[PDB]
Protein backbone atom coordinates (compact mmCIF):
# COMPACT_ATOMS: atom_id res chain seq x y z
CA UNK A 1 0.00 0.00 0.00
CA UNK A 2 1.83 3.32 -1.10
CA UNK A 3 2.53 6.24 0.85
CA UNK A 4 0.02 8.94 1.05
CA UNK A 5 1.04 12.37 0.56
CA UNK A 6 4.30 13.55 -0.47
CA UNK A 7 4.41 17.29 -0.32
CA UNK A 8 6.46 20.35 -0.45
CA UNK A 9 5.97 21.51 3.31
CA UNK A 10 5.27 25.53 2.98
CA UNK A 11 8.37 27.59 1.48
CA UNK A 12 10.43 24.43 1.94
CA UNK A 13 12.53 25.29 -1.06
CA UNK A 14 15.48 27.65 -2.43
CA UNK A 15 17.18 28.20 -5.85
CA UNK A 16 19.14 24.74 -5.09
CA UNK A 17 16.75 22.51 -2.96
CA UNK A 18 13.55 21.11 -1.87
CA UNK A 19 12.60 19.43 1.16
CA UNK A 20 10.03 16.95 0.96
CA UNK A 21 7.52 14.82 4.01
CA UNK A 22 5.23 12.56 3.84
CA UNK A 23 2.72 10.61 6.11
CA UNK A 24 3.66 7.53 7.81
CA UNK A 25 0.61 5.32 8.81
CA UNK A 26 -0.44 4.45 12.28
CA UNK A 27 0.94 1.42 12.06
CA UNK A 28 5.05 1.51 10.93
CA UNK A 29 5.67 -2.06 12.41
CA UNK A 30 6.99 -3.51 9.23
CA UNK A 31 8.46 -0.46 7.83
CA UNK A 32 11.99 0.56 8.63
CA UNK A 33 12.40 3.43 6.09
CA UNK A 34 11.47 5.26 3.07
CA UNK A 35 13.23 5.38 0.20
CA UNK A 36 13.13 8.83 -2.35
CA UNK A 37 13.47 8.67 -6.37
CA UNK A 38 13.60 11.79 -8.99
CA UNK A 39 12.16 10.85 -12.04
CA UNK A 40 12.15 7.27 -10.70
CA UNK A 41 16.45 7.39 -10.17
CA UNK A 42 17.07 6.90 -6.60
CA UNK A 43 18.26 10.03 -4.28
CA UNK A 44 18.52 7.94 -1.15
CA UNK A 45 17.46 6.86 2.33
CA UNK A 46 15.21 8.82 4.01
CA UNK A 47 17.39 8.26 7.42
CA UNK A 48 20.67 8.81 5.63
CA UNK A 49 19.18 12.18 4.75
CA UNK A 50 18.20 12.83 7.88
CA UNK A 51 21.76 12.09 9.53
CA UNK A 52 23.06 15.03 6.84
CA UNK A 53 20.43 17.22 7.59
CA UNK A 54 18.29 16.75 11.11
CA UNK A 55 19.71 17.86 13.82
CA UNK A 56 17.27 16.22 15.58
CA UNK A 57 18.17 13.07 14.32
CA UNK A 58 21.87 11.97 15.61
CA UNK A 59 19.82 12.52 19.40
CA UNK A 60 17.38 10.69 17.88
CA UNK A 61 19.62 7.44 17.28
CA UNK A 62 21.58 7.96 20.36
CA UNK A 63 18.03 7.55 22.21
CA UNK A 64 17.66 3.90 20.70
CA UNK A 65 21.62 3.25 22.04
CA UNK A 66 20.45 2.18 25.54
CA UNK A 67 17.55 0.09 24.37
CA UNK A 68 18.13 -3.73 24.77
CA UNK A 69 15.39 -6.21 24.95
CA UNK A 70 13.77 -3.73 22.27
CA UNK A 71 11.33 -1.87 24.60
CA UNK A 72 10.98 1.50 23.21
CA UNK A 73 8.93 1.80 19.76
CA UNK A 74 10.71 2.66 16.53
CA UNK A 75 9.85 6.04 14.80
CA UNK A 76 9.95 6.08 11.03
CA UNK A 77 11.30 9.29 9.24
CA UNK A 78 8.85 11.05 7.24
CA UNK A 79 10.75 13.92 5.66
CA UNK A 80 14.27 14.16 3.00
CA UNK A 81 15.67 17.54 1.85
CA UNK A 82 16.98 17.41 -1.84
CA UNK A 83 19.99 20.02 -2.49
CA UNK A 84 22.37 20.48 -5.26
CA UNK A 85 19.51 21.27 -7.58
CA UNK A 86 19.58 24.77 -10.37
CA UNK A 87 17.35 27.72 -10.45
CA UNK A 88 14.05 27.56 -11.41
CA UNK A 89 14.26 23.81 -12.54
CA UNK A 90 11.05 21.51 -12.44
CA UNK A 91 11.48 17.93 -10.57
CA UNK A 92 9.56 14.80 -10.15
CA UNK A 93 9.28 13.16 -6.97
CA UNK A 94 8.28 9.71 -5.40
CA UNK A 95 8.50 7.77 -1.93
CA UNK A 96 8.32 4.21 -1.24
CA UNK A 97 8.47 2.53 1.83
CA UNK A 98 11.09 0.10 2.51
CA UNK A 99 10.06 -2.87 4.84
CA UNK A 100 12.27 -5.27 7.24
CA UNK A 101 12.58 -7.93 4.35
CA UNK A 102 14.32 -5.39 2.61
CA UNK A 103 11.25 -5.37 0.03
CA UNK A 104 9.67 -1.12 -0.85
CA UNK A 105 6.57 -0.50 -1.75
CA UNK A 106 4.29 0.70 -5.12
CA UNK A 107 5.58 4.44 -5.12
CA UNK A 108 3.63 7.42 -3.84
CA UNK A 109 1.75 9.48 -6.40
CA UNK A 110 3.92 11.91 -8.01
CA UNK A 111 4.85 15.25 -7.21
CA UNK A 112 6.28 17.41 -9.48
CA UNK A 113 8.17 20.95 -7.90
CA UNK A 114 9.83 23.71 -9.31
CA UNK A 115 12.79 25.62 -6.93
CA UNK A 116 12.75 29.17 -6.92
CA UNK A 117 15.00 32.01 -9.04
CA UNK A 118 18.35 33.03 -7.53
CA UNK A 119 17.29 36.26 -4.71
CA UNK A 120 18.48 39.08 -4.43
CA UNK A 121 20.90 39.38 -1.74
CA UNK A 122 21.04 41.91 0.68
CA UNK A 123 23.61 41.90 2.92
CA UNK A 124 23.05 43.74 6.23
CA UNK A 125 27.13 45.19 6.58
CA UNK A 126 26.60 47.09 3.38
CA UNK A 127 24.03 49.69 5.45
CA UNK A 128 26.57 49.87 8.32
CA UNK A 129 26.44 46.43 10.60
CA UNK A 130 29.51 45.31 12.29
CA UNK A 131 30.15 42.96 14.69
CA UNK A 132 31.70 44.92 17.46
CA UNK A 133 30.10 46.33 19.97
CA UNK A 134 28.60 48.80 20.95
CA UNK A 135 26.80 48.79 17.63
CA UNK A 136 23.58 48.99 18.56
CA UNK A 137 22.68 48.02 14.36
CA UNK A 138 18.90 48.35 14.30
CA UNK A 139 18.88 50.50 11.83
CA UNK A 140 21.49 49.15 9.67
CA UNK A 141 19.58 45.87 9.71
CA UNK A 142 16.44 47.55 9.43
CA UNK A 143 17.40 49.77 6.19
CA UNK A 144 18.79 46.44 4.74
CA UNK A 145 14.70 44.77 5.46
CA UNK A 146 13.28 48.00 4.14
CA UNK A 147 15.75 48.39 0.88
CA UNK A 148 14.24 44.47 0.34
CA UNK A 149 12.91 43.79 -3.16
CA UNK A 150 10.04 41.12 -3.43
CA UNK A 151 11.68 37.53 -3.19
CA UNK A 152 15.45 39.71 -1.78
CA UNK A 153 17.54 37.41 1.23
CA UNK A 154 18.50 39.68 3.86
CA UNK A 155 22.47 37.56 5.03
CA UNK A 156 23.34 38.45 8.50
CA UNK A 157 27.16 36.75 8.24
CA UNK A 158 29.51 35.28 10.86
CA UNK A 159 29.71 38.14 13.95
CA UNK A 160 28.06 39.10 16.74
CA UNK A 161 25.14 42.27 16.03
CA UNK A 162 23.43 43.70 18.89
CA UNK A 163 19.76 45.00 17.79
CA UNK A 164 17.09 45.77 19.19
CA UNK A 165 12.86 45.16 17.88
CA UNK A 166 12.93 44.90 14.39
CA UNK A 167 10.31 44.71 11.83
CA UNK A 168 10.03 42.44 9.07
CA UNK A 169 7.64 42.39 5.89
CA UNK A 170 6.10 39.98 3.19
CA UNK A 171 7.66 38.36 0.35
CA UNK A 172 11.73 38.22 1.91
CA UNK A 173 14.03 35.81 3.62
CA UNK A 174 16.24 36.85 6.74
CA UNK A 175 19.12 33.67 6.62
CA UNK A 176 21.32 34.03 9.56
CA UNK A 177 24.72 32.56 8.17
CA UNK A 178 26.97 30.23 9.75
CA UNK A 179 28.30 32.23 13.13
CA UNK A 180 26.05 34.81 12.93
CA UNK A 181 24.95 35.85 16.23
CA UNK A 182 21.84 38.19 16.80
CA UNK A 183 22.13 39.55 19.77
CA UNK A 184 19.09 41.23 21.56
CA UNK A 185 19.81 44.87 23.27
CA UNK A 186 19.76 44.70 26.73
CA UNK A 187 17.62 48.33 26.52
CA UNK A 188 14.12 48.14 27.03
CA UNK A 189 13.87 51.41 24.68
CA UNK A 190 14.62 49.85 21.45
CA UNK A 191 11.49 47.32 21.81
CA UNK A 192 9.17 49.96 21.37
CA UNK A 193 5.17 49.09 21.77
CA UNK A 194 4.36 45.80 20.11
CA UNK A 195 0.96 44.01 20.27
CA UNK A 196 -1.71 42.48 22.17
CA UNK A 197 -2.25 39.09 22.23
CA UNK A 198 -5.91 39.13 22.07
CA UNK A 199 -8.37 41.94 20.57
CA UNK A 200 -9.52 41.86 24.04
CA UNK A 201 -6.09 41.68 26.00
CA UNK A 202 -5.68 45.20 28.02
CA UNK A 203 -1.85 45.33 28.47
CA UNK A 204 0.17 46.21 25.32
CA UNK A 205 3.33 44.43 24.82
CA UNK A 206 6.85 45.35 23.69
CA UNK A 207 7.90 44.45 20.56
CA UNK A 208 9.91 40.97 20.28
CA UNK A 209 13.56 40.73 18.68
CA UNK A 210 12.01 39.58 15.29
CA UNK A 211 8.51 40.96 14.54
CA UNK A 212 6.32 40.64 11.69
CA UNK A 213 3.36 42.24 13.42
CA UNK A 214 1.05 45.03 11.66
CA UNK A 215 0.22 48.14 13.86
CA UNK A 216 -3.30 47.53 13.97
CA UNK A 217 -4.60 44.02 12.75
CA UNK A 218 -3.94 40.15 13.23
CA UNK A 219 -5.58 38.68 10.28
CA UNK A 220 -4.24 36.15 8.54
CA UNK A 221 -2.84 37.13 5.33
CA UNK A 222 -1.97 40.97 6.55
CA UNK A 223 1.26 39.63 5.26
CA UNK A 224 2.72 37.00 3.30
CA UNK A 225 5.54 34.39 2.65
CA UNK A 226 7.99 35.41 5.26
CA UNK A 227 10.91 33.28 5.75
CA UNK A 228 13.49 33.00 8.65
CA UNK A 229 16.53 30.40 8.02
CA UNK A 230 20.44 29.69 8.17
CA UNK A 231 22.59 28.02 10.43
CA UNK A 232 23.06 30.93 12.85
CA UNK A 233 21.76 32.25 16.43
CA UNK A 234 18.96 34.18 17.43
CA UNK A 235 19.66 35.03 21.35
CA UNK A 236 17.40 36.99 23.18
CA UNK A 237 19.96 38.74 26.06
CA UNK A 238 16.94 38.02 28.54
CA UNK A 239 19.16 36.38 31.20
CA UNK A 240 22.10 35.63 32.77
CA UNK A 241 23.40 32.30 32.68
CA UNK A 242 22.46 29.34 35.73
CA UNK A 243 24.86 28.63 38.87
CA UNK A 244 26.02 25.65 36.48
CA UNK A 245 26.38 27.92 32.60
CA UNK A 246 27.13 24.85 30.64
CA UNK A 247 26.15 21.27 30.93
CA UNK A 248 27.23 18.25 28.38
CA UNK A 249 24.47 16.84 27.01
CA UNK A 250 23.64 12.96 26.48
CA UNK A 251 25.68 12.99 22.66
CA UNK A 252 28.52 15.11 25.24
CA UNK A 253 27.63 18.21 23.03
CA UNK A 254 27.51 21.78 24.85
CA UNK A 255 24.21 22.95 26.28
CA UNK A 256 23.47 26.41 27.68
CA UNK A 257 21.98 26.99 30.92
CA UNK A 258 20.19 30.59 32.05
CA UNK A 259 18.90 31.17 35.28
CA UNK A 260 15.09 29.88 36.65
CA UNK A 261 13.86 33.05 38.03
CA UNK A 262 10.33 34.32 39.51
CA UNK A 263 8.65 37.87 39.56
CA UNK A 264 10.92 38.81 42.79
CA UNK A 265 13.92 37.43 41.93
CA UNK A 266 14.21 38.87 38.43
CA UNK A 267 16.13 41.64 39.91
CA UNK A 268 19.01 39.54 40.11
CA UNK A 269 18.06 37.04 37.24
CA UNK A 270 17.54 39.24 34.13
CA UNK A 271 19.91 41.12 31.72
CA UNK A 272 16.82 42.43 28.98
CA UNK A 273 13.93 41.14 31.09
CA UNK A 274 15.69 42.76 34.47
CA UNK A 275 15.93 46.17 32.88
CA UNK A 276 12.25 45.93 31.37
CA UNK A 277 10.35 44.69 34.50
CA UNK A 278 12.42 47.34 36.10
CA UNK A 279 11.25 50.68 33.74
CA UNK A 280 7.13 48.90 33.25
CA UNK A 281 7.35 49.09 37.59
CA UNK A 282 8.91 52.86 37.73
CA UNK A 283 6.07 53.53 34.80
CA UNK A 284 3.33 52.70 37.26
CA UNK A 285 2.54 49.01 36.88
CA UNK A 286 2.90 46.42 39.68
CA UNK A 287 5.29 43.73 39.30
CA UNK A 288 3.34 41.13 38.95
CA UNK A 289 1.87 42.45 35.50
CA UNK A 290 5.25 44.22 34.96
CA UNK A 291 7.13 40.32 34.93
CA UNK A 292 4.25 38.70 33.06
CA UNK A 293 3.62 41.37 30.05
CA UNK A 294 6.85 43.27 29.65
CA UNK A 295 9.89 40.93 28.66
CA UNK A 296 10.15 40.59 24.97
CA UNK A 297 9.39 37.55 23.16
CA UNK A 298 12.46 36.29 20.88
CA UNK A 299 9.88 36.38 17.84
CA UNK A 300 6.26 37.21 17.35
CA UNK A 301 4.64 36.46 13.51
CA UNK A 302 1.95 37.95 13.53
CA UNK A 303 -1.40 37.47 10.79
CA UNK A 304 1.21 35.44 8.34
CA UNK A 305 0.11 33.68 5.25
CA UNK A 306 3.27 31.13 4.76
CA UNK A 307 5.86 31.25 7.17
CA UNK A 308 9.26 28.97 6.92
CA UNK A 309 11.91 28.95 9.92
CA UNK A 310 14.79 26.57 9.07
CA UNK A 311 18.09 25.84 10.76
CA UNK A 312 18.28 28.43 13.16
CA UNK A 313 19.46 28.19 16.75
CA UNK A 314 17.17 30.24 19.81
CA UNK A 315 19.27 31.25 22.57
CA UNK A 316 18.30 33.25 25.91
CA UNK A 317 14.75 34.66 24.96
CA UNK A 318 13.86 36.96 27.51
CA UNK A 319 9.85 36.02 27.65
CA UNK A 320 8.88 33.57 25.30
CA UNK A 321 10.56 31.95 22.39
CA UNK A 322 8.86 32.00 18.95
CA UNK A 323 5.34 33.21 18.78
CA UNK A 324 2.81 32.18 15.40
CA UNK A 325 -0.24 34.72 16.11
CA UNK A 326 -3.01 33.89 13.84
CA UNK A 327 -0.75 32.68 11.35
CA UNK A 328 -1.89 30.45 7.96
CA UNK A 329 0.69 28.06 6.39
CA UNK A 330 3.51 27.86 8.85
CA UNK A 331 6.81 25.52 9.05
CA UNK A 332 9.40 24.69 11.34
CA UNK A 333 12.72 22.40 10.37
CA UNK A 334 15.35 21.41 12.11
CA UNK A 335 15.23 24.30 14.54
CA UNK A 336 17.61 24.26 17.44
CA UNK A 337 15.82 25.55 21.14
CA UNK A 338 18.29 25.92 23.50
CA UNK A 339 16.67 28.19 26.22
CA UNK A 340 16.58 26.07 29.92
CA UNK A 341 15.45 27.22 32.02
CA UNK A 342 14.45 30.60 30.69
CA UNK A 343 11.16 31.66 32.79
CA UNK A 344 8.25 31.50 30.84
CA UNK A 345 11.19 30.30 27.40
CA UNK A 346 8.65 27.76 25.19
CA UNK A 347 10.03 27.01 22.57
CA UNK A 348 7.04 27.50 19.34
CA UNK A 349 3.76 28.78 20.60
CA UNK A 350 0.54 28.42 17.60
CA UNK A 351 -1.71 30.83 18.82
CA UNK A 352 -5.31 30.84 16.51
CA UNK A 353 -2.92 29.56 13.67
CA UNK A 354 -4.49 27.22 11.45
CA UNK A 355 -2.19 24.61 9.08
CA UNK A 356 1.13 24.04 10.91
CA UNK A 357 4.12 22.28 10.80
CA UNK A 358 6.59 21.08 12.98
CA UNK A 359 9.83 18.65 12.37
CA UNK A 360 13.44 18.36 12.74
CA UNK A 361 13.56 20.74 15.68
CA UNK A 362 15.62 19.96 18.70
CA UNK A 363 13.72 21.25 21.96
CA UNK A 364 15.55 21.99 25.31
CA UNK A 365 13.37 24.95 26.46
CA UNK A 366 12.41 27.08 29.55
CA UNK A 367 8.77 26.50 29.05
CA UNK A 368 6.72 24.11 27.21
CA UNK A 369 8.57 22.64 23.72
CA UNK A 370 4.90 23.14 21.52
CA UNK A 371 2.15 25.15 22.94
CA UNK A 372 -1.57 25.49 21.07
CA UNK A 373 -3.59 28.58 22.20
CA UNK A 374 -6.95 29.37 21.48
CA UNK A 375 -7.82 32.64 23.45
CA UNK A 376 -9.57 32.76 26.66
CA UNK A 377 -13.15 33.24 27.84
CA UNK A 378 -16.34 34.30 26.11
CA UNK A 379 -15.06 36.76 23.63
CA UNK A 380 -12.36 33.70 22.05
CA UNK A 381 -14.44 33.32 18.89
CA UNK A 382 -13.17 36.78 17.41
CA UNK A 383 -10.93 34.45 16.26
CA UNK A 384 -10.28 31.64 14.50
CA UNK A 385 -9.49 28.35 16.44
CA UNK A 386 -5.94 26.25 16.42
CA UNK A 387 -6.93 24.26 13.64
CA UNK A 388 -4.18 22.25 12.17
CA UNK A 389 -1.20 20.91 13.97
CA UNK A 390 1.44 17.80 12.83
CA UNK A 391 4.34 17.69 14.98
CA UNK A 392 6.87 14.95 13.53
CA UNK A 393 10.67 13.44 13.64
CA UNK A 394 11.80 16.06 16.60
CA UNK A 395 13.56 15.58 19.61
CA UNK A 396 12.01 16.24 22.94
CA UNK A 397 14.91 16.91 25.42
CA UNK A 398 13.56 19.14 28.82
CA UNK A 399 10.65 21.46 28.87
CA UNK A 400 7.31 21.55 30.47
CA UNK A 401 5.45 19.38 27.95
CA UNK A 402 6.34 18.05 24.23
CA UNK A 403 2.87 18.79 23.10
CA UNK A 404 0.42 21.27 25.49
CA UNK A 405 -2.74 22.17 24.46
CA UNK A 406 -2.68 24.65 25.85
CA UNK A 407 -4.47 26.57 28.84
CA UNK A 408 -5.45 29.04 26.80
CA UNK A 409 -8.47 26.44 24.66
CA UNK A 410 -11.09 29.63 23.90
CA UNK A 411 -11.38 29.41 20.15
CA UNK A 412 -10.68 25.62 20.00
CA UNK A 413 -7.42 23.84 19.85
CA UNK A 414 -8.20 21.03 17.21
CA UNK A 415 -6.89 19.07 14.42
CA UNK A 416 -3.52 18.06 16.06
CA UNK A 417 -0.86 14.73 15.15
CA UNK A 418 2.06 14.26 16.91
CA UNK A 419 3.75 11.11 15.35
CA UNK A 420 7.42 10.01 15.05
CA UNK A 421 8.56 11.95 18.17
CA UNK A 422 11.42 11.39 20.72
CA UNK A 423 11.32 12.54 24.05
CA UNK A 424 14.29 12.46 26.42
CA UNK A 425 14.05 14.31 30.09
CA UNK A 426 11.01 16.17 28.89
CA UNK A 427 8.49 16.70 31.89
CA UNK A 428 5.20 15.29 29.74
CA UNK A 429 4.71 13.79 26.66
CA UNK A 430 1.08 15.09 25.99
CA UNK A 431 -0.05 17.95 28.00
CA UNK A 432 -3.76 19.43 27.86
CA UNK A 433 -4.77 22.23 30.42
CA UNK A 434 -7.81 24.64 30.28
CA UNK A 435 -10.09 25.40 33.45
CA UNK A 436 -14.45 26.40 32.83
CA UNK A 437 -14.01 29.79 32.74
CA UNK A 438 -11.51 29.36 29.58
CA UNK A 439 -14.49 27.85 27.60
CA UNK A 440 -13.78 25.94 24.32
CA UNK A 441 -11.18 23.14 24.88
CA UNK A 442 -9.56 20.72 22.83
CA UNK A 443 -10.60 17.96 20.53
CA UNK A 444 -9.27 15.67 17.47
CA UNK A 445 -5.73 15.20 18.78
CA UNK A 446 -3.52 12.15 18.22
CA UNK A 447 -0.83 11.48 19.87
CA UNK A 448 1.12 8.80 18.45
CA UNK A 449 4.43 6.18 17.33
CA UNK A 450 6.78 8.41 19.87
CA UNK A 451 9.07 7.26 22.46
CA UNK A 452 9.48 8.25 25.44
CA UNK A 453 12.37 7.94 28.46
CA UNK A 454 13.54 9.45 32.14
CA UNK A 455 9.93 11.99 32.04
CA UNK A 456 10.24 14.27 34.95
CA UNK A 457 6.60 14.08 35.33
CA UNK A 458 4.16 12.15 33.83
CA UNK A 459 3.26 10.64 30.47
CA UNK A 460 -0.10 12.49 29.43
CA UNK A 461 -2.79 15.05 31.48
CA UNK A 462 -5.69 16.10 30.90
CA UNK A 463 -6.76 18.83 33.34
CA UNK A 464 -10.21 20.96 33.78
CA UNK A 465 -10.34 23.03 36.87
CA UNK A 466 -14.32 24.59 37.14
CA UNK A 467 -14.34 27.78 38.69
CA UNK A 468 -16.38 29.99 38.08
CA UNK A 469 -17.62 33.42 39.49
CA UNK A 470 -15.62 32.94 41.77
CA UNK A 471 -15.44 35.85 39.88
CA UNK A 472 -11.54 36.52 39.30
CA UNK A 473 -11.30 36.48 35.67
CA UNK A 474 -9.60 39.23 33.26
CA UNK A 475 -11.40 38.48 30.25
CA UNK A 476 -14.98 38.10 30.14
CA UNK A 477 -16.04 34.23 31.48
CA UNK A 478 -17.04 31.94 29.10
CA UNK A 479 -20.98 30.60 29.21
CA UNK A 480 -20.26 27.18 27.36
CA UNK A 481 -17.96 25.49 29.81
CA UNK A 482 -14.11 24.10 28.79
CA UNK A 483 -13.86 20.30 27.51
CA UNK A 484 -11.76 17.93 26.00
CA UNK A 485 -12.74 15.11 24.15
CA UNK A 486 -11.64 13.10 21.01
CA UNK A 487 -7.74 11.93 21.95
CA UNK A 488 -6.29 9.94 21.09
CA UNK A 489 -2.95 8.03 22.65
CA UNK A 490 -1.49 4.65 20.30
CA UNK A 491 1.90 2.91 19.74
CA UNK A 492 3.77 5.28 22.67
CA UNK A 493 6.13 3.52 24.93
CA UNK A 494 7.49 5.07 27.68
CA UNK A 495 10.62 3.89 29.92
CA UNK A 496 10.62 5.53 33.42
CA UNK A 497 8.95 8.47 34.91
CA UNK A 498 10.96 10.23 38.05
CA UNK A 499 7.99 12.04 38.55
CA UNK A 500 5.55 11.20 41.47
CA UNK A 501 2.01 11.70 40.11
CA UNK A 502 -0.15 10.12 37.95
CA UNK A 503 1.41 8.70 34.47
CA UNK A 504 -1.73 8.98 33.37
CA UNK A 505 -3.86 11.54 34.93
CA UNK A 506 -7.02 12.79 33.80
CA UNK A 507 -9.13 15.25 36.38
CA UNK A 508 -12.22 17.94 35.26
CA UNK A 509 -15.06 18.60 37.50
CA UNK A 510 -17.88 16.04 37.01
CA UNK A 511 -19.76 17.51 40.29
CA UNK A 512 -20.02 20.95 37.74
CA UNK A 513 -20.67 18.75 34.90
CA UNK A 514 -16.97 19.13 33.60
CA UNK A 515 -15.79 15.70 32.08
CA UNK A 516 -13.59 14.82 29.42
CA UNK A 517 -15.10 12.04 27.03
CA UNK A 518 -13.68 9.88 23.78
CA UNK A 519 -10.61 8.97 25.62
CA UNK A 520 -8.94 5.93 23.15
CA UNK A 521 -6.23 4.35 24.50
CA UNK A 522 -4.57 1.46 22.50
CA UNK A 523 -1.15 -0.54 22.40
CA UNK A 524 1.04 1.64 25.18
CA UNK A 525 3.89 0.47 27.35
CA UNK A 526 4.85 1.98 30.32
CA UNK A 527 8.18 0.96 32.61
CA UNK A 528 8.70 2.05 35.88
CA UNK A 529 5.84 4.76 36.13
CA UNK A 530 3.62 5.91 38.59
CA UNK A 531 -0.18 4.27 39.20
CA UNK A 532 -2.54 5.98 36.95
CA UNK A 533 -5.36 8.89 38.53
CA UNK A 534 -8.50 9.41 36.49
CA UNK A 535 -11.15 10.89 36.50
CA UNK A 536 -14.31 12.52 35.53
CA UNK A 537 -13.89 10.36 32.02
CA UNK A 538 -16.76 9.26 29.72
CA UNK A 539 -17.02 6.70 26.88
CA UNK A 540 -13.02 6.49 26.75
CA UNK A 541 -11.28 3.15 26.09
CA UNK A 542 -7.66 1.93 27.07
CA UNK A 543 -6.51 -1.36 25.44
CA UNK A 544 -3.12 -3.16 25.41
CA UNK A 545 -1.45 -0.35 28.36
CA UNK A 546 0.68 -2.63 29.45
CA UNK A 547 2.81 -1.25 33.10
CA UNK A 548 5.99 -3.59 33.90
CA UNK A 549 7.87 -2.04 36.95
CA UNK A 550 5.03 -0.16 38.20
CA UNK A 551 5.86 2.28 41.40
CA UNK A 552 2.72 1.00 43.27
CA UNK A 553 0.64 -2.05 43.44
CA UNK A 554 -2.29 -1.88 40.96
CA UNK A 555 -2.03 0.28 38.02
CA UNK A 556 -5.66 1.18 37.63
CA UNK A 557 -7.48 3.88 39.69
CA UNK A 558 -10.64 5.31 38.72
CA UNK A 559 -13.35 7.86 40.12
CA UNK A 560 -16.41 9.30 38.60
CA UNK A 561 -16.61 7.21 35.27
CA UNK A 562 -19.16 6.56 32.82
CA UNK A 563 -18.45 3.91 29.80
CA UNK A 564 -14.87 2.72 30.03
CA UNK A 565 -13.36 -0.35 29.96
CA UNK A 566 -9.88 -1.57 30.26
CA UNK A 567 -9.73 -4.49 27.59
CA UNK A 568 -12.76 -3.51 27.00
CA UNK A 569 -14.77 -4.64 30.61
CA UNK A 570 -15.77 -2.21 31.91
CA UNK A 571 -16.76 0.28 34.89
O1 LIG B 1 0.21 34.90 28.15
C1 LIG B 1 1.01 34.41 27.32
O2 LIG B 1 1.82 35.08 26.64
C2 LIG B 1 0.97 32.87 27.15
O3 LIG B 1 -0.12 32.36 27.97
C3 LIG B 1 -0.24 30.90 28.02
O4 LIG B 1 0.97 30.34 28.59
C4 LIG B 1 1.22 30.67 29.98
C5 LIG B 1 2.73 30.97 30.13
O5 LIG B 1 3.13 32.26 29.61
C6 LIG B 1 3.46 29.78 29.47
O6 LIG B 1 4.81 30.06 29.16
C7 LIG B 1 3.30 28.57 30.43
O7 LIG B 1 3.77 28.84 31.78
O8 LIG B 1 1.87 28.28 30.43
C8 LIG B 1 0.95 29.40 30.80
C9 LIG B 1 -0.52 28.95 30.66
O9 LIG B 1 -0.84 28.24 29.68
O10 LIG B 1 -1.33 29.32 31.55
C10 LIG B 1 -0.39 30.29 26.62
O11 LIG B 1 -0.51 28.85 26.68
C11 LIG B 1 0.84 30.73 25.79
O12 LIG B 1 0.81 30.14 24.49
C12 LIG B 1 0.90 32.29 25.72
O13 LIG B 1 -0.22 32.83 25.01
NI1 LIG C 1 25.11 7.43 25.44
NI1 LIG D 1 24.37 33.93 26.33
NI1 LIG E 1 11.32 25.32 32.82
NI1 LIG F 1 3.88 26.09 33.27
Redo the contacts with the bound molecule.
Sequence with gaps: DAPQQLQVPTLAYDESSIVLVWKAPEDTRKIVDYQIFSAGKLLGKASDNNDNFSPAKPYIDHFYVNDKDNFQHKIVMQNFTVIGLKPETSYQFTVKAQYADGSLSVASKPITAKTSAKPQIVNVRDFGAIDDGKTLNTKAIQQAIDSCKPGCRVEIPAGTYKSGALWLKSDMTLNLQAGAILLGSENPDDYPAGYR?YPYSTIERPASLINAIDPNNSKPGTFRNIRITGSGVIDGNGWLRAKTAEITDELGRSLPQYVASKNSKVHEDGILAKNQVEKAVSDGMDLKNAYGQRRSSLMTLRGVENVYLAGFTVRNPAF?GIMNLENHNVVANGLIHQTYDAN?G?GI?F?NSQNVMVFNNFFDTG??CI?F?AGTGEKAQEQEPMKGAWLFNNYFRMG?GAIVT???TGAWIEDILAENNVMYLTDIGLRA?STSTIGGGARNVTFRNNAMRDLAKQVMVMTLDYADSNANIDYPPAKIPAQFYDFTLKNVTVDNSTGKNPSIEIKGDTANKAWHRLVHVNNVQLNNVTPTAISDLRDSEFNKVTFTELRGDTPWHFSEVKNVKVDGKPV
Design positions: LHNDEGDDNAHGSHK
